[PDB]
Amino acid sequence: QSPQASALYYDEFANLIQHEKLDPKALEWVGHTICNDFQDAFVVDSCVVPEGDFPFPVKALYGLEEYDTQDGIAINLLPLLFSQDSPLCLAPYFRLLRLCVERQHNGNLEEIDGLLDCPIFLTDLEPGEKLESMSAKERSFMCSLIFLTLNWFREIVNAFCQETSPEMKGKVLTRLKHIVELQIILEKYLAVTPDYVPPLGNFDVETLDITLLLHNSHAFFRELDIEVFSILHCGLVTKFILLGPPELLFLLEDLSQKLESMLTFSHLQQRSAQEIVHCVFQLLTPMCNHLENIHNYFQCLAAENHKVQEYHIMSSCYQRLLQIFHGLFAWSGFSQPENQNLLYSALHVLSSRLKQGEHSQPLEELLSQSVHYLQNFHQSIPSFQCALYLIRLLMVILEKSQNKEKIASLARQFLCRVWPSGDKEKSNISNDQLHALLCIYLEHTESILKAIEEIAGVGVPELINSPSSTFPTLTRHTFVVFFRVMMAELEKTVKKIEPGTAADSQQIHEEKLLYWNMAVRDFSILINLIKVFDSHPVLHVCLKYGRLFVEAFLKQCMPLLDFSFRKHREDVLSLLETFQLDTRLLHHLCGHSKIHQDTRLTQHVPLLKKTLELLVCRVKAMLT
Structure with a gap:
């Protein structure tokens, strides 16, 4: 009824x-x-x-x-x-x-x-x-x-x-x-x-x-x-260059929405996570490797030759192939000991895409062969989201292990790339994706401060040439996100430095005080680039992270000024004359916050003002 x-x-x-x-x-x-x-x-x-x-x-x-x-x-x-x-x-x-x-x-x-x-x-x-x-x-x-x-x-x-x-x-x-x-x-x-x-x-x-x-x-x-997903076995026939691209987009978009929902829906939910990843290991990897390599050969010819919709579908097909790999290997059931043989079979497939014969290998050796196969796709990627998913895939596979250099080099390669400026193509370079890639790059680099000096030696010619630089995804628009991630990773590196003691050796004293000196000079160049750019959110983010920098300098540099004063007088007077220029600059930025009467900025002014009075009275205390 x-x-x-x-x-x-x-x-x-x-x-x-x-x-x-x-x-x-x-x-x-x-x-x-x-x-x-x-x-x-x-x-x-x-x-x-x-x-x-x-x-x-x-x-x-x-x-x-x-x-x-x-x-x-x-x-x-x-x-x-x-x-x-x-x-x-x-x-x-x-x-x-x-x-x-x-x-x-x-x-x-x-x-x-x-x-x-x-x-x-x-x-x-x-x-x-x-x-x-x-x-x-x-x-x-x-x-x-x-x-x-x-x-x-x-x-x-x-x-x-x-x-x-x-x-x-x-x-x-x-x-x-x-x-x-x-x-x-x-x-x-x-x-x-x-x-x-x-x-x-x-x-x-x-x-x-x-x-x-x-x-x-x-x-x-x-x-x-x-x-x-036994249908995705059939080979790709690419309609642009010469199972089609959109009939594979459907199955990959389905398997993505399945594994994301299940691992992180009636018919699926009666199967365990373990059996789902177990059957996907057979029905993805040794059949989608062929589709990945055919896609590499497609985007190689799309680069060599240079209609729109088949390339737009194949770009999203590449994005989904890498998103499947990311979701597969970022499964939190591989921390468990029963599944590492399955990881050893999976990495045996990714090592076996260049050469076979290296059976029962050590784990980091399979990682080296696998990542050496995987890295060389960075040239066939047509938009930014796919690049972001490849770098995060490489991160979470090399987290099992030195590895910093590979991630840093590849993130630099993706920041250096053209990224062809179709309107929807530059819309795939959206602000949060860039924030995630630059936090990966600036965290995984050898030296955070030297990377910030590289970005503040390339972030200043955005004004001189382009009314778009010699390091692209760097415009006046993207300056806001680059600035936020820059000062954010500056804060994450600077809060970690510990004050020693007066009993501590002279070597570690000199190296950490010169680290504080390059940190305050990096803060000076980061604050000094405000005066040329307007844009409400840029001055808001620097008035936020400026305060959290000077508070870090109060809690974790002033003990080093107390400990190394009798011996390192020239070093501490250089530090204080270096910090006084950014103190006067922060005075000027709080003044700039008052004169326009910006409501978002003027919430964080009085704490910044009283912390500048606290640091100057502390400087009077150290000089006495």
Whole structure:
């Protein structure tokens, strides 16, 4: 009687079948009823006009057309949903039917393989830009119809992914391209009318909880299997340079959203994290290495030659390949001792992509061969997010081990790169991604202060040449993020230096006081570059981190001024005359904060003022 209840029945019975290989006396009983009830409930003669007065051209759409068009088995959808205002159950009911016939005939679908070829009784679901501002119940009809047919097709690709016949694989791949086209059409219909949501979630948890594109991608649509990623085995055929790029984008975007949700969703959540990463180790690595190398060979020719949309899809395909590797190896179950053999098999694959024969190697040797293979992709990367995911991947694989030099060199290589300035391409160089890469680079460098002198020797010619530098991703816009990460890593390096004692040797005394001297001179050059740039957030971030620098200088330099005063008088007077210039500069910056009356800046003025009075009275105390 109730559609959600029939759906729940079908779902829960289906869960019973998938989970439990019971003695099929009941399943051989019920399946003979369920196949018949299916083939009378939805299956009609493939007559392109169904009965019903629709304001919609109803056809037998999204057929494979390699079969005979004048056929029997088609599936009635729009006359069912119109008669409601049975089809809400179609996904789970087919799931049940699929599972029972797989239990009966032992994976033999010789009765059904006509259903993968079948056209579907649908309206023309076309870009209806001509049918705009008629945001009535018909748009809910269309949005719900595309939702159901996508869910239907997702349940078909769940069904026929296990079958190894090549024609069936081709039929599945034609269905995958159909899926991504109808996904862009549905997110377009939600861009046409946003409040028009079709409420059809899965039933274990989501339906008891109540009773835009990211909600539907996981929770509202039918959840795919992991055996569906047996399709990504097929080789890439790159449509721009000469299984296609968008039909691989779909599977990789699915596996990404699966492993991110699970490791850091009904069908997936009944499997352990361990079995998921275990089966992904076989169904990613020795088959996606080929796709990664073919992609390297594609972006090598995209560099050698130099239409837009196939390169845009392949860039995102590269991003997803590296994001899968990052999510795979940043799994927190490899800290556990049982899984290191699996890590030894995984790193055996990444070492084996240059040379084989080095079996039962030491761990850091496999890391060296693996990272030597992986580093050389930095030239084939087309946007910044993929570069960010490659550097973080290399970080979290070499964290098992000296390694600082590799990360520092590669982060410098990515900051030095062109990054071709398409508007959406420079939009992939967004401020938070850059912040993450520069915190990686400035933390992993040999000397934080010398790296800050490199950036403050290249951050000042942004004004002289470009009204974009000799070190790109450095504009007047990106100056704010470079400045914030620069002074932030300056604070992280400077809070770590400990004051010794007067009993401490003269060598360690001289080296840490000259470290304080280069720290205060780096603070002077960081503060002195404010006067030429305006921009409210830049002066806010330096009035924040200026104060936290001078407080670090109060807590952790003034004890060294107390300890080494009798012996190192020339050094401490050089330190104090160096700090007095930035004290007067910070006085001027607080004055600049008062004169404009900026509300965001003038919260942090009085603490800065009283700390400058505390440091000058401390300087009077040290001189006496």
